[PDB]
């Protein structure tokens, strides 16, 4: 999936994806749908996950420490939608930037990892349809997936990764 980026990320900045951090969609729509978006909390929300990696990044984790066996998701409070939900992945979805503007990842494997996370969330919440939508807004640091590589911050429009439905 092509992920456009404002400052052309160099080839050296092509980290593996070793987890993520999401936030629940508040409200009460009786329709059997549970919407998750990229986190909206401050840096404290990401630090509370304890997935300290060699890369300081928003939206999704990079070059961190992966999971032992399968995906592990720990949230300080599930019913509470204000507190974010962390995620560690079993296998990483490598994200390689072409060097120019775009930064591309797998076209389909991302859908597979999304379905895996969606089932791991189904088991936690109601066994119902799950939807991944993009960020609800915020500052350019957290609205656009930012990562601090080699002394430079690179922002990328992650709108291409969160437009999925799973029944």
């Amino acid at each position, epitope marked *: 999936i092509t992920l456009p980026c404002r400052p052309a990320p160099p080839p050296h900045c092509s980290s593996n994806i070793t987890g993520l951090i999401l*936030t629940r969609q508040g409200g009460y729509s009786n329709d059997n749908t549970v919407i998750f978006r990229p986190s909206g909390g401050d840096w404290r929300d990401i630090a509370r996950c304890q997935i300290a990696g060699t890369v300081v990044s928003t939206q999704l984790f990079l070059n961190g420490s992966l999971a032992e066996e399968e995906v592990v998701i720990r949230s300080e409070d599930w*019913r509470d939608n204000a507190k974010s939900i962390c995620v560690q992945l079993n296998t990483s979805v490598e994200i390689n930037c072409t060097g120019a503007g775009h930064c591309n990842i797998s076209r389909a494997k991302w859908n597979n990892t999304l379905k895996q996370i969606a089932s791991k969330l189904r088991e936690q919440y109601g066994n119902k349809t799950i939807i991944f939508k993009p960020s*609800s807004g915020g500052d350019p640091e957290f609205v656009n997936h930012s990562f601090n590589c080699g002394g430079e911050f690179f922002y990328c429009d992650s709108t291409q990764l969160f437009n999925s439905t799973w029944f």
Partner: antibody
Amino acid sequence: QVQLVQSGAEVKKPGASVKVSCKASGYTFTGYYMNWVRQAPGQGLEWMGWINPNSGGTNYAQKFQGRVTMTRDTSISTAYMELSRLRSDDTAVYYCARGKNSDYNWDFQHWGQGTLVTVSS
Amino acid sequence: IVMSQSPSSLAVSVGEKVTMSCKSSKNYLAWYQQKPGQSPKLLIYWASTRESGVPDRFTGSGSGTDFTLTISSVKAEDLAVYYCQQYEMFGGGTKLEIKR
């Protein structure tokens, strides 16, 4: 000496947009999440959304997505809730709320005085 | 994860003992009192934890999906509507009227 002061009541035509303000004084504005609660006229309280005053990230209610946007101005410590596609059935009293402890939300100790927005032709 | 609050209306005499229920669907529950013409005030902020300055007659209880608010010695000033909140959901109802 904490104080949350909202804007004044006003009228908008169906489909227009209304931006309600919330000036906060008496604490570190960037510490406590800011929520916006709408009280329908005699029909109970329904929460709309919350905004983080640092990252600016927002979590809206599934009933208001695609119709609301929350923003902030930390230089003057003012939250903003803008509502577009204004339906005539959305005339209510809009409050801004904070919470007692910076860690936990949803225990609104402070409230604004209110803001009665009216929507009619 | 909806919630209901009962009874809707409730008329009583001064000094009488009042007890209202809130059925959800040491938990994080709150009770707000909205007096005529004012914004809500947080009476109880953790199922049974009264706010600073809240007189002692107000007591909250409950652990499971059911909870309860109670006023021992009602007073004319306690006339108001009472809301029970869990996370992002408010119960509504429970208007405390006064006999005279």
